[PDB]
Design a protein around this ligand. Structure first.
Ligand SMILES: Cc1ccnc2c1NC(=O)c1cccnc1N2C1CC1
Ligand SMILES: [Mg+2]
Lengths: 525, 401
């Protein structure tokens, strides 16, 4: 039989003592037939009045079916039951699977009901079938197997299935079995007749421990729709997403559209949501209607075209290399694809995470590489070889002078415009005979020049940036700027090429036009 | 054998820490190691009823082609009861000429672990792409990297170490976690031999690399540029650096130096220094020639270590308990950035152990995800300091090196 897992209640806690709700002679009749079928099956056993714990039971019928079902409400038992090691809380991504010639899904029936429950814990599973006559019975029972709806069932079940399946796995290294809750996906490369026979041997093996599964005639056939994917033994994709042809778009419509579109990016390359996301600005209600912009519908129209052509992902070939490739799609947007054979994508993606208010493409490209690397270790257990549109020299120049430690794995330059470059470089030492601007919102130069300008609604820090803006504006192609603003120095010295701040974007516009610029900080008073 | 009972601090529960993802290479390594530890009965497979977890990793041994299982027991150590006296740090170890660090980790495996504590040591070998559930185990013996292991093993160790200790009291012996720091003044040749002997003198009883020279460790002082001519720009960087430093050493005046700065002069204008500005600079320079007076190590406080990426393969670091009151400052020079950083962390950690007998809490200039990904590629120590991730201010880097 399957070995028992020891269970306990959270410390300093007693079993549930809750009142069974008043039933109905009708429902009492049903529960009594159900519990009787069950006690003959060993699943449950009548108990003495020795036991003081109680859990409410009730009866429902099958959804769109005329037949009685027994439900047991375990909220209280559950609040008091100890925590278990998480059930499978992380799932496989299709791109990390290996192709199989045939895949079969075996649905396990009465899974839980076939597994024993800790002998000393059974008492807490007590429930009561009420009598129809006043001083007549009031049938008491406890569970002997794992109850549906109880906290520890999924975990105990998974754990046990794993022990039952182990022997079969050793004798059958050819077969690959994946356990997902109630299902068993079983794949192999055997000739189809050999496969069918193995599946039968698995069914036999599982029957020895009382586990029932569906016969060849009643087994689901690929493709399998799983977790938003559509799986074939030889390829995968997201289950078809269809774009509406509405003329009126609600704020809510757009968020659903963006969500779906986002999901599609994992295999559909070229998907864009920037303009559809812009429709959300300042919206006042989930039911407000927003008209599309010339831009939002070009984008929508473009996405609608990409999605028409169904594209599938290919499965992983462990004997081959993983290559990851990256392209700048637009300002702050990057797309990548990971493949083993050219244009035969295992998976695609987009990166737009801005980590901070100001950045440059080098920094951002580097964070893109990190994300992909982490994703890769998780799906395939190894880092891919990257192809990036940046030359080592640009990379090295930035890395070498940035204050944070950084690293980019094995990479090959790929000439795919647009190429990433640094748009400007700050001088490392002061420029000889270039005017010197002393800023504090206004400046004074060594040549007697000056401007004390006016700003309203300006914050302390934003007044500092403005001053620098002024100096850059009224100066020539070579400047020396002296500021006491460690904040400004920080922003600019990171050499951003894009910013959330408009003012920063202007300063940036000026830094790109200059020949040589040198920034220096000096203490306050 | 007889198990000494161990317990968590009052009211605490066991750890539930997530396992950072591992590459196929490290997983296989761990599956190999753990399979034989299980045959030997050091670890056992557990069931779903144990909800605890500690991250595990595989590092390479130094100049050995074998892997070492590394267990991140940081969370559990913080929660293990404090222990209960013949271990307080020998201040003589820092002045020794030669010091050898030995890994006495396997000794711990011969002593069983309190049956009730065991569940807290749970860990998991993850699988790739979550295709399989992940193997779960817990220790039956004292694990390497747990603060309880050296404590519980204290007695059995003093005993096997009293002979060498009196048959060779020219040697200092300190144990911290899995290591034994053996110190001496002998010639580096006399040393390696005496070290080998201890090796067999431990092999005698069943026990089975790193060579330091603490006598040659020194402080990295704050420095001032010395130069032929001084431009307006030089003086400016000078006053800025001096001003910062004045908060540590108040005797620093900048009055005359600031005076040469009046006017809105061109940044490149050379400025011959007066007689007063010259003497002022002289005194400042004199002041900074040594560590500020007064600072002392408080064993009841945390040791904090900060690192800065200078450039060209150079890093600066300071160790303090209170800001500006540095216990030590230093420099580290060389690869890639991450590798350099890990080696600087391990080096700074060993130092702290050797000087104060404790590991520092680091403030690292790197993003978490990058660090979490690569540190184990280059890690070699058998311990793991605590660390946090920070954004270095461009001004501080300047003020160092
Ligand atoms: C959902 C799922 C999760 C994990 N593995 C698989 C599957 N399902 C499949 O249909 C699948 C498809 C292709 C190859 N293996 C597959 N299988 C492997 C087990 C044979
Ligand atoms: Mg000023």
């Amino acid at each position: 039989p399957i070995e028992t897992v020891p269970v306990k209640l959270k410390p300093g806690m007693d079993g549930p003592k809750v009142k069974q709700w008043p039933l109905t002679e009708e429902k009492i009749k049903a529960l009594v037939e159900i519990c009787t079928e069950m006690e003959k099956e060993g699943k449950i056993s009548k108990i003495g009045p020795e036991n003081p714990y109680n859990t409410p039971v009730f009866a429902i019928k099958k959804k769109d079916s005329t037949k009685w079902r027994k439900l047991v409400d375990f909220r209280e038992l559950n609040k008091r039951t100890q925590d278990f090691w998480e059930v499978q809380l992380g799932i496989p991504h299709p791109a990390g699977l290996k192709k199989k010639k045939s895949v079969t899904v075996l649905d396990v029936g009465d899974a839980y009901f076939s597994v024993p429950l800790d002998e000393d814990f059974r008492k807490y599973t007590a429930f009561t079938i009420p009598s129809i006559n006043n001083e007549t019975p009031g049938i008491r029972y406890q569970y002997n197997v794992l109850p549906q709806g109880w906290k520890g069932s999924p975990a105990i079940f998974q754990s046990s299935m794993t022990k039952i399946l182990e022997p079969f796995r050793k004798q059958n290294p050819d077969i690959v079995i994946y356990q997902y809750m109630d299902d068993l996906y079983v794949g192999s490369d055997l000739e189809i007749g050999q496969h069918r026979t193995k599946i039968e041997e698995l069914r036999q093996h599982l029957l020895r421990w009382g586990l029932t599964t569906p016969d060849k005639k009643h087994q689901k056939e690929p493709p399998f729709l799983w977790m938003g994917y559509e799986l074939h033994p030889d390829k995968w994709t997201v289950q078809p997403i269809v774009l509406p042809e509405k003329d009126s778009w609600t704020v809510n419509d757009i968020q659903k559209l963006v969500g779906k579109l986002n999901w599609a990016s994992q295999i559909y390359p070229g998907i864009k949501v920037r303009q559809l996301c812009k429709l959300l600005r300042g919206t006042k209600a989930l039911t407000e209607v927003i008209p599309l912009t010339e831009e939002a519908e070009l984008e929508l129209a473009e996405n609608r075209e990409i999605l028409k052509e169904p594209v599938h992902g290919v499965y992983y070939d462990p004997s081959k290399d993983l290559i990851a490739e990256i392209q700048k799609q637009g300002q702050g947007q990057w797309t990548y694809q990971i493949y083993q054979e050219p244009f035969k994508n295992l998976k695609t993606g987009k990166y737009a995470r801005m980590r901070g208010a100001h950045t440059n493409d080098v920094k951002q490209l580097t964070e893109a590489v990190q994300k992909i690397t982490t994703e890769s270790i998780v799906i395939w257990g190894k880092t891919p070889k990257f192809k990036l549109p940046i030359q080592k020299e640009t990379w090295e120049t930035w890395w070498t002078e940035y204050w944070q430690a950084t690293w980019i794995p094995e990479w090959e330059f790929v000439n795919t415009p647009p190429l990433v470059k640094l748009w400007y470089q700050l001088e490392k030492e002061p420029i000889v005979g270039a005017e010197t601007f002393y800023v504090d919102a206004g400046y004074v130069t060594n040549r007697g020049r000056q401007k004390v300008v006016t700003l309203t609604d300006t914050t302390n820090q934003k007044t500092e940036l403005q001053a620098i803006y002024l100096a850059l504006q009224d100066s020539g192609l070579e400047v020396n700027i002296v500021t006491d603003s460690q904040y400004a120095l920080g922003i600019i010295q990171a050499q951003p090429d894009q910013s959330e701040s408009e003012l920063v974007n202007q300063i940036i516009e000026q830094l790109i036009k200059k020949e040589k610029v040198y920034l220096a900080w000096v203490p306050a008073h | 054998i007889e198990t000494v009972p161990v317990k968590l601090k009052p009211g605490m529960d066991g750890p539930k820490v997530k396992q950072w993802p591992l590459t196929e290479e490290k997983i296989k390594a761990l599956v190999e190691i753990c399979t034989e530890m299980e045959k030997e009965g050091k670890i056992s497979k557990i069931g779903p009823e144990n909800p605890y977890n500690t991250p595990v990793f595989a590092i390479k041994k130094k100049d050995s082609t074998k892997w070492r299982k590394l267990v991140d027991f940081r969370e559990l150590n913080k929660r293990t009861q404090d222990f209960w006296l013949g271990i307080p740090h020998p201040a003589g170890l820092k002045k020794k000429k030669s010091v050898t660090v030995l890994d006495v980790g396997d000794a711990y495996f011969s002593v069983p672990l309190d049956e009730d504590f065991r569940k807290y040591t749970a860990f998991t070998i993850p699988s790739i792409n979550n295709e399989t559930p992940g193997i779960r185990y817990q220790y039956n013996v004292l694990p390497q990297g747990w603060k309880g292991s050296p404590a519980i093993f204290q007695s059995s160790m003093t005993k096997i170490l009293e002979p060498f200790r009196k048959q060779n009291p020219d040697i200092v012996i300190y144990q911290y976690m899995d290591d034994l720091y053996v110190g001496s003044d002998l010639e580096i040749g006399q040393h390696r031999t005496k070290i080998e002997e201890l090796r067999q003198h431990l092999l005698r009883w069943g026990l089975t690399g790193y060579e330091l020279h603490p006598d040659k460790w020194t402080v990295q002082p704050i420095v001032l540029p010395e130069k032929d001519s001084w431009t307006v720009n030089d003086i400016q960087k000078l006053v800025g650096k001096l001003n910062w430093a004045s908060q540590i050493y108040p005797g620093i005046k900048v009055r005359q130096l600031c005076k040469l700065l009046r006017g809105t002069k061109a940044l490149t204008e050379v400025i011959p220094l007066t007689e007063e500005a010259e003497l002022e600079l002289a005194e400042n320079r004199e002041i900074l020639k040594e560590p500020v007076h007064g600072v002392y190590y408080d064993p009841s406080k945390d040791l904090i270590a900060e690192i800065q990426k200078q450039g060209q393969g150079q890093w600066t670091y300071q160790i303090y308990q209170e800001p500006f009151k540095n216990l030590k400052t230093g420099k580290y020079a060389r690869t890639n950035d991450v590798k350099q950083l890990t080696e600087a962390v391990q080096k700074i950690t060993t130092e702290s152990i050797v000087i104060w007998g404790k590991t520092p809490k680091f403030k690292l200039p790197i993003q978490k995800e990058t660090w979490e990904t690569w540190w184990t590629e280059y890690w070699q120590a058998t311990w793991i300091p605590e660390w946090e991730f920070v954004n270095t201010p461009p001004l501080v880097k300047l003020w160092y090196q």
